Amino acid sequence: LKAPVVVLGAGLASVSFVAELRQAGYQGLITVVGDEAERPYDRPPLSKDFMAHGDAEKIRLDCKRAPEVEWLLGVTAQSFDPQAHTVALSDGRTLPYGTLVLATGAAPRALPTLQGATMPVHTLRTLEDARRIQAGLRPQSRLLIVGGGVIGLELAATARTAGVHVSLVETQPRLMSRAAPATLADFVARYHAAQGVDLRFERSVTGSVDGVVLLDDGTRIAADMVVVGIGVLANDALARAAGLACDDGIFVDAYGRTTCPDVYALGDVTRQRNPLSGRFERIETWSNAQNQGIAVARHLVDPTAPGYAELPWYWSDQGALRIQVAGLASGDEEIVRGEVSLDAPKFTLIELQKGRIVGATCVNNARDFAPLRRLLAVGAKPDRAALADPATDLRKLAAAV
Amino acid sequence: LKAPVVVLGAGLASVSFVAELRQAGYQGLITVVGDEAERPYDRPPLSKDFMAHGDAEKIRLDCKRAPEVEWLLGVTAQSFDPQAHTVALSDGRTLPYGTLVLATGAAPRALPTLQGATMPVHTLRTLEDARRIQAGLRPQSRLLIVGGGVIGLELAATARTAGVHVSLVETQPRLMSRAAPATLADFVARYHAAQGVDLRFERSVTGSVDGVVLLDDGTRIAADMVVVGIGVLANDALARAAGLACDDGIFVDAYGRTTCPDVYALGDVTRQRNPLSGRFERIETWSNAQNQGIAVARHLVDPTAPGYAELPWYWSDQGALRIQVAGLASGDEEIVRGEVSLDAPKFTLIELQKGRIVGATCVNNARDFAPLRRLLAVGAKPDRAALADPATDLRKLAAAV
Ligand SMILES: Cc1cc2nc3c(=O)[nH]c(=O)nc-3n(C[C@H](O)[C@H](O)[C@H](O)COP(=O)(O)OP(=O)(O)OC[C@H]3O[C@@H](n4cnc5c(N)ncnc54)[C@H](O)[C@@H]3O)c2cc1C
Ligand SMILES: Cc1cc2nc3c(=O)[nH]c(=O)nc-3n(C[C@H](O)[C@H](O)[C@H](O)COP(=O)(O)OP(=O)(O)OC[C@H]3O[C@@H](n4cnc5c(N)ncnc54)[C@H](O)[C@@H]3O)c2cc1C
């Protein structure tokens, strides 16, 4: 940890990192460069209560555990020179650094077949994006969503609540193909279909003409607006130009180190080890942004601290479904606790590998999720009959292990 | 470049690296730790003329462009401490380093289903392995090869020449699935079948009993010896234990830097950018070991030098087939120069992407391969009719571009 510290990006990973630097006792300069001219804000509300209610002053991040930080908002870092230890800014200024931290996140992938579209086509990443989409959620209008990921489905639910007609096209045979157990994905599809979403599986967009989107089965979907949600691409251009190892994401170890000395990276922009799979992955979650930012900061201030070690998890709010997913989507065994039903949905899935818990899901059961994450963290091998048995309380099991 | 330099591994990448350090003008200490008690040697002969003729004094690497190097042969590096800048050796000694270079290569993957086998099961990586296999190539014995990669096929050809009966099992529907154009792979299968190899496609080994191997179609193959060649796994254990970013290979940038300051890696152990695909890959070739070793050394001595930038290529000698393959296996177009025939085989393939050369293959045509590699290097977009036209000479085309 060499002063001064410069962080590129002012999202959750950056805010979490600089707050932990201060809490851990670092008292040198910290400067954060953020391209959005916005008080730092959290993204999960954008497809949830913000999309529904519109008050951005409910979604700001707390920067008060980050005192004495200069936030350069509305400024783009254009390049850095890792030999000279400087960053070039879009406003003509240059920042010196002792330690540079790349926390630049990820941006929605564009859909090549809609490149020349003459109808509204949006993606959903920023506050600006959310305000633009919301301005078009007219009651009884028609929305087409491309992609059955969690964000598309949260938007689908929000739009249906607002009285908007919703169609959704997904190339895979299931929703949430990226990080959800098949049992969950099948149930979620049934839920959205029951709520009026017109779901089209194993279909891809081939183009559009005069307000109508074309599909690869030779058919058409008319819409007033298209929202593309087919995933994100790491914002790693500065790292690539400066010579760091990257591949749709900056490679980092558990200390947040890139291949360039004195340069670290954190959050959505990184490709990092998933401890459960033991493979490198670009993690795209709120908990990773916060937890990885905190761990990297802690170890910079105190090199005796462990590297980042948290296991992955996320949540998604989709209408009446409060979904929580931890760890791996599958193993060699799934245990289902409760009935899987559209009538007052409430259930838990547990994924095991050779008897060891490797993942869990809760739908409308926050109370089960915390003890399951603890059992997952220690790789618990509990009695499978008890895991299934409705009489088992998981909190005590987590306390006993 | 901080002295002293320590290199772990004494294969081609290591030898190429230390020779280039000396040629570039570095005069400080260099110590190489190699676990094999063997004068450094090249591996390609092991499935080729060595397997056939047995003289290891024809396969040694030239260490004479690497003067003043201490080679610790027969010694295993057990760990390194990147804070203390030391390496712990199996003989009880410790080496200090200013710059550590990990050049530890890769080892054959074991086949889980043959773990408890009570018949000879070998892999082919080392001189010791080659001598062991050769000692069993009895005329009229039966060899089963698991895996249709280049090394398995070179062994198949060598064994057939020696009068050994050969069967080969491949899980994919084609040979050389990893890095060869389908047109080449189809031809190579026809060649081996014509030479008496019993090829079994889309089959996998499920086990073995009393000298007989079991397949997933419920059938059996009797053999006197099995050679497993289903690929390799990076020897990255020291890097993993020391906290570097790795995933079946140590991640490096074009300067050979790992995520740990003062630690570099090169050759088969690395996962690195393929400039043609723009994706990270673990390259498994002789040319990468030599060329990456040289480039990393050059830039350590002279930081103004470019990073590693060579495009991938390899060769394979399989009986009457002298195969050379460069770049990508496929694009959006293949051009075939010559007839593809078992009668005096001689042809060239060119792979293009939007008119740009992205790969090439020569079978028994070394003269075409050099100019094609030059056209590939500059991403030439030549006239496709001329590329097909037998009247075109490629050397002049390469000289003109
Ligand atoms: C609509 C939406 C809903 C989501 N819902 C959930 C959820 O419910 N649960 C969950 O687990 N996760 C959710 N997420 C994911 C979560 O919000 C992300 O994982 C998190 O935002 C990643 O934070 P980050 O700081 O790494 O990146 P970002 O939030 O992307 O912040 C990076 C910032 O850096 C800026 N930047 C990029 N390049 C430069 C440059 N050169 N110079 C200056 N600034 C630059 C970017 O514009 C951005 O402002 C959601 C995300 C979205 C978009
Ligand atoms: C049979 C065979 C045929 C091949 N044919 C071709 C061909 O025709 N064309 C082609 O392009 N490529 C071919 N190759 C591939 C080519 O030989 C490899 O790409 C090359 O050997 C990689 O060199 P390297 O120095 O990175 O690794 P290696 O050659 O594997 O050298 C690494 C050395 O480090 C040692 N080591 C590992 N861990 C430690 C430790 N902890 N301490 C000390 N030493 C350690 C290893 O045992 C090994 O001796 C062939 C390989 C084989 C095995």
SS (H, E, C) chain B: CCCCEEEECCCHHHHHHHHHHHHHCCCCCEEEEECCCCCCECCHHHHCHHHHHCCHHHCECCCCCCCCCEEEECCCEEEEECCCCEEEECCCCEEECCEEEECCCEEECCCHHHCCCCCCEEECCCHHHHHHHHCCCCCCCEEEEECCCHHHHHHHHHHHHCCCEEEEEECCCCCCCCCCCHHHHHHHHHHHHHCCCEEEECCCEEEEECCEEEECCCCEEECCEEEECCCEEECCHHHHHHCCCECCCEECCCCCECCCCCEEECHHHEEEEECCCCEEECCCCHHHHHHHHHHHHHHHHCCCCCCCCCCCEEEEEECCEEEEEEECCCCCEEEEECCCCCCCCCEEEEEEECCEEEEEEEECCHHHHHHHHHHHHCCCCCCHHHHHCCCCCHHHHHHHC
Q: Rounded CA gap, B269 and B232, in Å?
A: 10
Q: List CB contacts (< 8 A) between B244 and chain A.
A: 253
Report the b/e string of A359-376 with b at 16+ CB within 10 A. Answer: bbbbbbbeebbebbbbbb
CA of B105 relative to ligand 2 center, distance in Å? 5
Q: Which ligand minimizes its atom distance to the CA of B126? A: 2
Q: Three-state DSSP class for A259?
A: coil
Residue nearest to atom 41 of ligand 1 (CA): A77
CB A375 within 8 A of CB A398: yes
Record the tokens describing residue B32, joined without a space: 């190489």
Which of A257, A259, A261 shows the shortest C-beta gap to B252?
A: A259
Interface residues on A facing B, Cβ-Cβ cutoff 8 A:
243-245, 247, 251-255, 257-261, 272-273, 278-280, 307
Sign of the C-alpha dihedral, residues A97, A102, A103, A109? positive
Cα–Cα separations (whole angstroms), residue B96 to B84, B99, B259: 8, 9, 20
Q: Rounded CA gap, A281 and A111, in Å?
A: 22
Q: List CB contacts (< 8 A) between A280 and chain B.
A: 245, 247, 251
Cα–Cα separations (whole angstroms), residue B394 to A140, B202, B241, B249: 64, 38, 49, 37
Which residue, among A85, A111, A80, A65, has the nearest Cα to A8 in the 3D structure? A80
Resolution of this entry, Å: 1.4
Q: Rounded CA gap, B278 and B363, in Å?
A: 27
Count of residues for chain B? Answer: 401
Q: Rounded CA gap, A170 and A124, in Å?
A: 17
Classify B397 in phi/psi space as left (phi over 0), alpha (psi -120 to 50) or beta.
alpha
Q: Rounded CA gap, B166 and B151, in Å?
A: 14
Q: Rounded CA gap, B68 and B3, in Å?
A: 14
Give first-to-last CA distance, chain A, whole Å: 37
Which residue, among A47, A345, A58, A63, has the nearest Cα to A184 in the 3D structure? A345
Residues in contact with B9: Cβ distance below 8 Å, sequence separation at least 6, in sequence order: B32, B33, B34, B35, B102, B103, B104, B105, B235, B267, B269
Q: Rounded CA gap, B91 and B109, in Å?
A: 27
Count of residues for chain A? Answer: 401
Which residue, among A124, A24, A12, A8, has the nearest Cα to A61 in the 3D structure? A12
Q: Rounded CA gap, A375 and A382, in Å?
A: 9
Record the tokens describing residue B248, joined without a space: 């079946």
- Phi/psi of residue A110, nearest 5 degrees: -80, 150
Domain with CATH 3.50.50.60 in chain B: 1-105+234-312, 109-231
Residue tagged 């489905």 (tokens): A153
- Domain B313-401's class? alpha beta
CB B303 within 8 A of CB B248: no
Report the b/e string of B63-80 with b at 16+ CB within 10 A. Answer: beebeebebbeebebeeb
CB B146 within 8 A of CB B120: no
Q: Do B258 and A259 touch (CB under 8 A)?
A: yes
Q: Three-state DSSP class for A368?
A: helix
Q: Rounded CA gap, A126 and A34, in Å?
A: 13
Q: Rounded CA gap, A389 and A8, in Å?
A: 49
Residues linked to residue A257 through DSSP beta bridges, in sequence order: A264
CB A9 within 8 A of CB A285: no
Residues in contact with B127: Cβ distance below 8 Å, sequence separation at least 6, in sequence order: B36, B38, B41, B46, B50, B56, B59
Q: List CB contacts (< 8 A) between B100 and chain A.
A: none
Instruction: Please give the helix or strand (H or E) that residue A273 lies within, else none.
Output: strand A270-274
Record the tokens describing residue A368, joined without a space: 């089960």
Q: Rounded CA gap, B224 and A379, in Å?
A: 43
CB A156 within 8 A of CB A166: yes
Question: Prior bond to A4 cis, omega within 30?
Answer: yes
Breaks (C-N over 2.5 A) in chain B follow: none
Which residue, among A364, A358, A286, A356, has the nearest Cα to A329 in the 3D structure? A358
Q: With DSSP H G I counted as helix, E B as strand and the rest as coil, what are the percentages for chain A, rounded to 5?
A: 25, 30, 45
Q: Rounded CA gap, B138 and A231, in Å?
A: 57
What is the CB neighbour count within 10 angstroms for residue A29?
Answer: 16
Cα–Cα separations (whole angstroms), residue A67 to A19, A22, A71, A102, A265: 8, 7, 11, 20, 22
Residue nearest to atom 33 of ligand 2 (CA): B9
CA of A108 relative to ligand 1 center, distance in Å? 10
Q: Rounded CA gap, B167 and A63, in Å?
A: 67
Q: Rounded CA gap, B169 and B175, in Å?
A: 10
Instruction: Please give the helix or strand (H or E) that residue A282 lies within, else none.
Output: none
CA dihedral B33, B38, B44, B47 (to 10 degrees): -140
Q: Do B243 and A254 touch (CB under 8 A)?
A: yes
Instruction: Please give the helix or strand (H or E) that residue A119 lies within, else none.
Output: none
CA dihedral B177, B179, B181, B185 (to 10 degrees): -50
Q: Rounded CA gap, A31 and A379, in Å?
A: 40
Does A1-105+234-312 carry CATH code 3.50.50.60?
yes
Q: Rounded CA gap, B51 and B137, in Å?
A: 9
Q: List CB contacts (< 8 A) between B280 and chain A.
A: 245, 247, 251
- What is the Rg, in whole angstroms, of the alpha carbon atoms belonging to chain B? 22
CB B155 within 8 A of CB B290: no
Q: Between helices B286-301 and B12-24, what is the axis angle to 10°? A: 30
Domain with CATH 3.30.390.30 in chain A: 313-401
Residues in contact with B29: Cβ distance below 8 Å, sequence separation at least 6, in sequence order: B3, B4, B5, B70
Number of H helices, E strands in chain A: 10, 26
CB B50 within 8 A of CB B58: yes
Record the tokens describing residue B236, joined without a space: 């990255």
Q: Rounded CA gap, B199 and B166, in Å?
A: 9
State which CATH number among 3.90.1150.10, 2.30.42.10, 3.30.390.10, 3.50.50.60 fits the domain covering B109-231: 3.50.50.60
Residue tagged 């959050």 (tokens): A267
Q: Rounded CA gap, B124 and B349, in Å?
A: 29
Q: Rounded CA gap, B261 and A261, in Å?
A: 6
Cα–Cα separations (whole angstroms), residue B203 to A230, B167, B168, B224: 36, 12, 10, 20
Q: Which residues line ligand 1 (CB under 6 A)?
A: A 8-14, 33-36, 43-44, 46-47, 76-77, 103-106, 124-125, 151, 235, 238, 267-268, 284-287, 289, 314-316
Residue nearest to atom 4 of ligand 1 (CA): A44
CB B321 within 8 A of CB B364: yes
Residues in contact with A50: Cβ distance below 8 Å, sequence separation at least 6, in sequence order: A56, A58, A59, A127, A130
Record the tokens describing residue A341, joined without a space: 């039903």
CA of B248 relative to ligand 2 center, distance in Å? 15
Output the CA angle A384-A386-A392, nearest 5 degrees.
145
Q: Do B243 and A273 touch (CB under 8 A)?
A: no
CA of A268 relative to ligand 1 center, distance in Å? 7
Q: Between helices A12-24 and A286-301, what is the axis angle to 10°? A: 30
DSSP state of A24: H
Residue tagged 């790349």 (tokens): A102
Which of A253, A261, A279 shows the shortest C-beta gap to B243?
A: A253
Q: Which of B251, B277, B279, B300 to mutate: most A Cβ within 10 Å? A: B251
Q: Three-state DSSP class for A211?
A: coil
Amino acid at B48: K
CB B47 within 8 A of CB B143: no
Record the tokens describing residue B392, joined without a space: 């075109």
Method for structure elucidation: X-ray
CA dihedral A230, A236, A240, A246 (to 10 degrees): -70
Residue tagged 């996320």 (tokens): A314
Record the tokens describing residue B132, joined without a space: 């062991």
Q: Rounded CA gap, A106 and A9, in Å?
A: 11
Q: Rounded CA gap, A252 and A130, in Å?
A: 31
**Burial (CB count within 10 angstroms: exposed 0-12, middle 13-18, buried 19+), residue B50:** buried
CB A7 within 8 A of CB A87: no
Q: List CB contacts (< 8 A) between B236 and chain A.
A: none
What is the CB neighbour count within 10 angstroms for residue A3?
Answer: 13
Q: Do B253 and A259 touch (CB under 8 A)?
A: yes
Record the tokens describing residue A46, joined without a space: 């954008």
Report the b/e string of A112-145 with b at 16+ CB within 10 A. Answer: ebbeebebebbbbbbbebbeebbeebeeebbbbb
CB A139 within 8 A of CB A164: yes
Strand duo A321-327 + A313-318: pairing: antiparallel
CB A28 within 8 A of CB A5: yes
DSSP state of A136: T
Which residue, among B295, B314, B60, B63, has the nearest Cα to B181 in the 3D structure? B314
Strand duo B86-89 + B94-96: pairing: antiparallel
Q: Do B251 and A251 touch (CB under 8 A)?
A: yes
Q: Three-state DSSP class for A3?
A: coil
Q: Rounded CA gap, B270 and B11, in Å?
A: 14
CB B294 within 8 A of CB B138: no
Q: Rounded CA gap, A85 and A100, in Å?
A: 8
Instruction: Please give the helix or strand (H or E) that residue A115 lies within, else none.
Output: none
Record the tokens describing residue A42, joined without a space: 């959290």
